[PDB]
Every structure is written in C-alpha cells, then in structure tokens.
C-alpha cells in the first residue's frame, strides 16, 4: 500500500540529516514501520534522499 515514490510522505518520516524517525515519536503502526524502513532504503540507493547532512 505504501510505496517509495511518494517522497513527501518520506519527508515527514525522516530528519534534516536523513535519519529515520522511529515509531515512538510519530506514533505509527509497527506493520508500516518495517515497511517504511525498507521503502527509504530503496530511495537511498536511487539518490532520492540524502544519507547525512554532511553532503
């Protein structure tokens, strides 16, 4: 249902340094949290979100 292409949803789920916010802060479901984790790692290979705030 969730997908890696809608990066605006992924912008709400990362930090300014590209770090993945856990479900403790956002309060999302744990089923989506494993799905959101692998969805960002797909976008991390395709140069869609930065790794760190270094570059």
């Amino acid at each position: 249902e969730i997908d890696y292409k809608d990066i605006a949803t992924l912008k709400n789920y990362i930090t300014e340094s590209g770090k993945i916010v856990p479900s403790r802060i956002t309060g999302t479901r744990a089923k989506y949290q494993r799905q959101l984790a692998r969805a960002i790692k797909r976008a991390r290979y395709l140069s869609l979100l930065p790794y760190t705030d270094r570059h």
Binding site: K5, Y45, L46, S47, Y51, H55
Partner: protein, 106 residues
C-alpha cells in the same frame, strides 16, 4: 509469471539515446510473451547526493510483466552498457497500472 518494476537511470550526456533504448528492449520482452504496464519518461532530475561526479540524472521508470528469460539478459546488458550507471529491479505483488507521483505533479 512474475511482476517486475525495473528502475534504471541514464547518463545525462546521452539523454537523446533514451527513446532508442526503449523500443529495442521492448521487442525482446514482448516477443517472448512479456507484458508491459507502465512506461514513463521523467527527464533530468536533481540528485540528493552526487554519484559518479555528476548531476541532473535522467530517470526512466518501468513496469515489466515477463518470465525469467529477460531477467537474465537485461541485467547483463545494463552492466555491459556504460550509459546506465545504476540498475535496480524489484519484485512486486501484482501487475499494477498507476501513474507515479512524479508524473502527477509535473
């Protein structure tokens, strides 16, 4: 039969060779009973971080429904060609026909 989403990016200096690579790879898939569901050209796109010392990468998004014959050959000619700098395939759950959010916003 499996359902693949094929993501491959093109070197920005050879962006005019993109419609040649579309129809040459299509005839090999559809001849061996391979379906097609999505073929969307995006043009150049700004990178989140630089790769191969370049910027403004060309993006082509695909959905190919085809058996395991083309999955052997097409990943080798991506590594054989120097225009494709990144190749990525993935298995999906079903044959899907839906526009990307990049096309729906641009």
């Amino acid at each position: 039969m499996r359902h693949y989403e094929i993501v491959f990016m093109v070197h920005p200096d050879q962006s005019e060779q993109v419609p040649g690579m579309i129809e040459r790879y299509t005839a090999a898939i559809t001849g061996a009973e391979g379906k097609i569901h999505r073929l969307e050209d995006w043009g150049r796109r700004q990178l989140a971080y630089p790769i191969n010392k370049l910027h403004k990468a060309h993006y082509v998004l695909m959905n190919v429904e085809a058996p395991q014959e083309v999955i052997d050959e097409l990943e080798t000619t991506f590594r054989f060609n120097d225009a494709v700098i990144r190749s990525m395939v993935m298995r999906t759950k079903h044959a899907v026909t839906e526009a990307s959010p990049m096309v729906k916003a641009k």
